[PDB]
């Protein structure tokens, strides 16, 4: 019933660039094994537990986020379902902690190696420690995406990564077949160490802001006479390409002597090779799918012919061209031919040899297309990322200038926006933001208007604002921007508004740098042109950098807006018949419509002590699924994905059913999916299935204490099972089953979880219970300091520590930064009132509850928040007064009472 705060340690993760994936078709083996060594572990720089973990990231790790995760504080690898991690003490997936049996282990040892095998073919994942057979192996794991070796660490640790076969020296011999190598890449870039999904990077002058990753890695890693002429010309061109090059003909095969055996006359051509020539000619003529006397005959030099009888000659019409895009299409045809060869060597040849091989080889094939066009003419025939500042940085008047530098030239927009900015909306789409995009060359307000010129690489852009006559000016390379119509970048009659805030939007794969004018000497421009006209930079002296709030792409459930365009929720009260319910209305029949919807309630349900946990999904009348009775913690949320369906639909009720845990949802239309959430949150187009499982066994090195895991119960779907093609109306309901209670005097879901009225049998709807519905894009605060992270296979030295204050939400099971409260202003008020209640309870001489509060809030938190200087200010004074009231106030009162009397004794020091 109250929000909790505590100090926690930052954790980060890094990456070697390795792509391992198995799927249908050709795959790069799938058996991979890597080992990583640590040389030391730091003892405890800070009052916290040092954590290092190694594992497999799969896709969408979310580990790089330096802030509040789902667990208490930050997360590394293995805390989520997508990531599998190992440190020694437990196997970690989805924030679980079941132990693993190892002989005499310290969980952090110096000069220790840890090995692991991917084992793509069999669903088990292999982990290797000296004399330690792993009890559990992860089963039923999704193969979508690419698997990554990923290391997660806290500060103070130095750790070495073995490169592999070329440089790494493994203490344990690999199991046969696992073939540890670098596996290369289609760009053939050298392997390097990088942070996974880095939004901010280090730069020469300040930090560099970059966009989202490209994530495109999911890929695998009449005419008959002309045809006869093309076949004989192809054989002649093979012999002639041999003639021009160093290849001298010889019946014996010798590459060092450049001998080519298959060189003979056209009438004496080898029949399989002749029909192979005709076969590639036919394949060519299939891939297009869209005279002879006049043609000249080219000569042949005496050096060209040394030994062979057949003297080849091209058609001597080699001086015109049509188009190189046809050559590009022919190169694509050769790429599909290479793909056919790869399929033949994958499914029929079982060969392993190096359309995504190398760009140089593709260009080589493009030039070695072998004048086919010449012969033919001789014959004749995720979301973008938005960065702004805090709402407290808004300015009403004055003249303000800031600078931007573009490292790369992509799709980026720069402008000023209102203090309230709607997320998940492109800049300039509405009246909120006045923005400009110079990639296409338009200003963007209520549509796009052609204005300005495109940028080159590495040019500065200055933004200039004036409020007295209300004009915003833009400057590139020290010159004022010029519109097509005219005027020197004048926006006429802008409203003063509640405020103005600089905003910048970056697309995928672009690097930029922002300058707010903290240092006047750092500014490369503005020295004269900004000076005069009364213009000043944004911040002459603030003694600290700005907050730089940023948009985050992560599905978090938020309450429904009171006024949505086509989504409303109505409360239906209980009558003398039927239970009360919540009904969903879509409206807006025509023009715009809905696409997809998934929504859950706003409360949870913890099980006792594991006792039963047999939440058998949709009992109806003898349910077939019979949901697994497992999961010790299982915080379950009544949830359903309603998809897309017209008219009145979805009416979630609350019926006791003498089940102590039953609900009800009757819909007349079609169907949906009534499931059960459990802190997962993952919106996907394939909502029919494809849920993350990754269940383990956790046996005892002999499949003794096995009994495989349940992989939670977040996928409690049922789809369109018990139904027909008749459809008609009223598709019944489904009672959300749970753990029953000892009652039955002759029970509702609302009776559960709600801190009393469990005994009361009557169903009721308290005002707390409401439907949220999921939103993809959120707003977050970038930290003011980032944790820091090249020989012998590379090594990383963590060094100095960082710590962060964490504020966890009880029901949501979600942690949040305490400084973000400055934007919330409701939880700030609640926390201030909670602090006031804490002071009032321990007010006058109650040292027992002072001890209780000192247990509730630690001394270290009070000492750390003393010098924060980033708190909103009411919380700061609240913590000051709490620290004063808990300990020092009583002695101060006693001394104040004693100060009045003056009782002096006789001592020689009193005489002096």
- Work out the radius of gyration: 36 Å
Strand content: 15-25%
- How many helices in DSSP terms? 11
Helix content: 10-25%
How far apart, in Å, are the first and last alpha carbons? 61 Å
Main beta-sheet annotation: 8 strands, mixed
| CA-based shape | globular
Helical/strand content category:
alpha+beta
Count all strands and give the number: 39
Topology:
Elements lengths: L3 E6 L2 E5 L16 E8 L11 E5 L27 E3 L3 E3 L5 E2 L12 E6 L8 E4 L2 E2 L15 E5 L4 E4 L31 E3 L4 E3 L4 E4 L12 H22 L26 H18 L35 H24 L11 H9 L4 H8 L5 E3 L12 E7 L5 E6 L15 E5 L4 E3 L3 E3 L9 E7 L4 E6 L2 E2 L20 E6 L4 E5 L20 E2 L11 E9 L10 E5 L8 E5 L12 E3 L36 E5 L7 E5 L10 E2 L7 E5 L96 E8 L13 E3 L5 E7 L4 E4 L3 H4 L2 H15 L5 H10 L2 H8 L7 H25 L9 H4 L1
Parallel strand pairs: 17-27
Antiparallel strand pairs: 1-38, 2-11, 2-13, 3-8, 3-12, 4-5, 4-11, 5-6, 6-7, 8-9, 9-10, 12-37, 14-15, 15-26, 16-25, 17-22, 17-26, 18-19, 18-25, 19-20, 20-21, 22-23, 23-24, 28-36, 29-30, 30-33, 31-32, 32-35, 33-34, 38-39
Give a written overview of the molecule.
- It is classed as transport protein.
- The entry lists the keywords Ryanodine Receptor, RyR1, Intracellular Calcium channel, Mg2+, Inhibition, Excitation-Contraction coupling, transport protein.
- The entry is titled "Cryo-EM structure of rabbit RyR1 in the presence of high Mg2+ and AMP-PCP in nanodisc".
- The protein: Ryanodine receptor 1.
- Organism: Oryctolagus cuniculus.
- It was solved by cryo-EM, 3.1 Å.
- The protein has 912 residues and is of the alpha+beta class.
- Helix content is 16%, strand content 20%.
- The protein is built from eleven helices and 39 strands.
- The strands form eight sheets. Strands 14, 15, 17, 22, 23, 24, 26 and 27 form an eight-stranded mixed sheet that branches. The chain has a seven-stranded antiparallel sheet with strand order 7-6-5-4-11-2-13, with no helix packed on it. The protein has a six-stranded antiparallel sheet with strand order 10-9-8-3-12-37, with no helix packed on it.
- A hairpin with an 8-residue loop joins β29 and β30 (581-585).
- α1 packs across α2 (271-288).
- It is globular, with a radius of gyration of 36 Å.
- The two termini are 61 Å apart.
């Amino acid at each position: 019933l109250l929000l909790q705060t505590n100090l926690i340690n930052y954790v980060t993760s890094i990456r070697p660039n390795i792509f391992v994936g198995r799927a249908e078709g050709s795959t790069q083996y799938g058996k991979w094994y890597f080992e990583v060594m640590v040389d030391e572990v730091v003892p405890f720089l800070t009052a916290q537990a040092t954590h290092l973990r190694v594992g497999w990231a799969l896709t969408e790790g979310y580990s790089p986020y330096p802030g509040g995760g789902e667990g208490w504080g930050g997360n590394g690898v293995g805390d989520d379902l997508y990531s599998y991690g190992f440190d020694g003490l437990h196997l970690w997936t989805g924030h679980v902690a079941r132990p693993v049996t190892s002989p005499g282990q310290h969980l952090l040892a110096p000069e220790d190696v840890v090995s692991c095998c991917l084992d793509l073919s069999v669903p088990s994942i292999s982990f290797r420690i000296n004399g330690c057979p792993v009890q559990g192996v992860f089963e039923a794991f999704n193969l979508d995406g690419l698997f990554f070796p990923v290391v997660s660490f806290s500060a103070g640790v130095k750790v070495r990564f073995l490169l592999g076969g070329r440089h790494g020296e493994f203490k344990f011999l690999p199991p046969p077949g696992y073939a540890p190598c670098h596996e290369a890449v289609l760009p053939r870039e050298r392997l390097r160490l990088e942070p996974i999904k880095e939004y901010r990077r280090e730069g020469p002058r300040g930090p560099h802001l970059v966009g989202p990753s490209r994530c495109l890695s999911h890929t695998d890693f009449h005419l008959e006479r002309i045809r006869e002429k093309l076949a004989e010309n192809i054989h002649e061109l093979w012999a002639l390409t041999r003639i021009e090059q160093g290849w001298t003909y010889g019946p014996v095969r010798d590459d060092n002597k450049r001998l080519h055996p298959c060189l003979v006359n056209f009438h004496s051509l080898p029949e399989p090779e002749r029909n192979y020539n005709l076969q590639m000619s036919g394949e060519t003529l299939k891939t297009l799918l869209a005279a002879e006397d006049n043609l000249k005959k080219t000569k042949l030099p005496k050096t060209y012919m040394m030994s062979n009888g057949y003297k080849p000659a091209p058609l001597d019409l080699s001086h015109v061209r049509l188009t190189p895009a046809q050559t590009t299409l022919v190169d694509r045809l050769a790429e599909n031919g290479h793909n056919v060869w790869a399929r033949d060597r994958v499914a029929q040849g079982w060969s392993y040899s190096a359309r995504l091989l190398d760009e140089a080889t593709k260009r080589s094939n493009r030039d070695s297309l072998c004048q086919a066009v010449r012969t033919l003419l001789g014959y004749g025939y995720d979301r973008v990322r938005i960065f702004r500042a805090e709402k407290s940085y808004t300015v009403q008047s004055g003249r303000w200038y800031f600078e931007f530098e573009a490292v790369t030239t992509g799709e980026m927009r720069v402008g000023w926006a209102r203090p309230e900015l709607r997320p998940d909306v492109e800049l300039g789409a509405d009246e909120l933001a006045y923005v400009f995009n110079g990639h296409r060359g338009q200003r963007w307000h209520l549509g796009s208007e052609p204005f300005g010129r495109p940028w080159q690489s590495g040019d500065v852009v200055g933004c200039m604002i004036d409020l007295t006559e209300n004009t915003i000016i833009f400057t590139l390379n020290g010159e004022v921007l010029m519109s097509d119509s005219g005027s020197e970048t004048a926006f006429r009659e802008i409203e003063i508004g509640d405020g103005f805030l600089p905003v910048c939007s970056l697309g995928p794969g672009q690097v930029g740098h922002l300058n707010l004018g903290q240092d006047v000497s750092s500014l490369r421009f503005f020295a004269i042109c900004g000076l005069q006209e009364g213009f000043e930079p944004f911040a002459i002296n603030m003694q600290r950098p700005v907050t730089t709030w940023f948009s985050k792409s992560l599905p978090q459930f938020e309450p429904v807006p009171p006024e949505h365009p086509h989504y409303e929720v109505a409360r239906m009260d209980g009558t003398v018949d039927t239970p009360p319910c919540l009904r969903l209305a879509h409206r807006t029949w025509g023009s715009q419509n809905s696409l997809v919807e998934m929504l859950f309630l706003r409360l949870s349900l913890p099980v006792q002590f594991t006792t039963t946990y047999y939440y058998s999904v949709r009992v109806f009348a003898g349910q077939e699924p019979s949901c697994v009775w497992v999961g010790w913690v299982t915080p379950d949320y009544h949830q359903h994905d309603m998809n897309f369906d017209l008219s009145k639909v979805r009416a979630v009720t609350v019926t006791m059913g003498d089940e102590q845990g039953n609900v009800h949802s009757s819909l007349k239309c079609x169907x949906x999916x009534x499931x059960x959430x459990x802190x997962x949150x993952x919106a996907x187009x394939x909502x029919x299935x494809x849920x993350x499982x990754x269940x383990x066994x956790x046996x005892x090195x002999x499949x003794x204490x096995x009994x495989x895991x349940x992989x939670x119960x977040x996928x409690x779907x049922x789809x369109x099972x018990x139904x027909x093609x008749x459809x008609x109306x009223x598709x019944x309901x489904x009672x959300x089953x749970x753990x029953x209670x000892x009652x039955x005097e002759l029970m509702p879901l609302s009776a559960a979880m709600f801190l009393s009225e469990r005994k009361n049998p009557a169903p009721q709807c308290p005002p707390r219970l409401e439907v949220q519905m999921l939103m993809p894009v959120s707003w977050s605060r970038m930290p003011n300091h980032f944790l820091q992270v090249e020989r012998l296979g590379w090594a990383v030295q963590c060094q100095d520590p960082l710590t962060m204050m964490a504020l966890h939400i009880p029901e949501e099971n979600r942690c949040m930064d305490i400084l973000e409260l400055s934007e919330r202003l409701d939880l700030q008020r609640f926390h201030s009132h909670t602090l006031r209640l804490y002071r009032a309870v321990c007010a006058l001489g109650n040292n027992r509850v002072a001890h209780a509060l000192c247990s509730h809030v630690d001394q270290a938190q009070l000492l750390h928040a003393l010098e924060d200087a980033h708190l909103p200010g009411p919380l700061r004074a609240g913590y000051y007064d709490l620290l004063i009231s808990i300990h020092l106030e009583s002695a101060c009162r006693s001394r104040r009472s004693m100060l009045s009397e003056y009782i002096v004794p006789l001592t020689p020091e009193t005489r002096a």
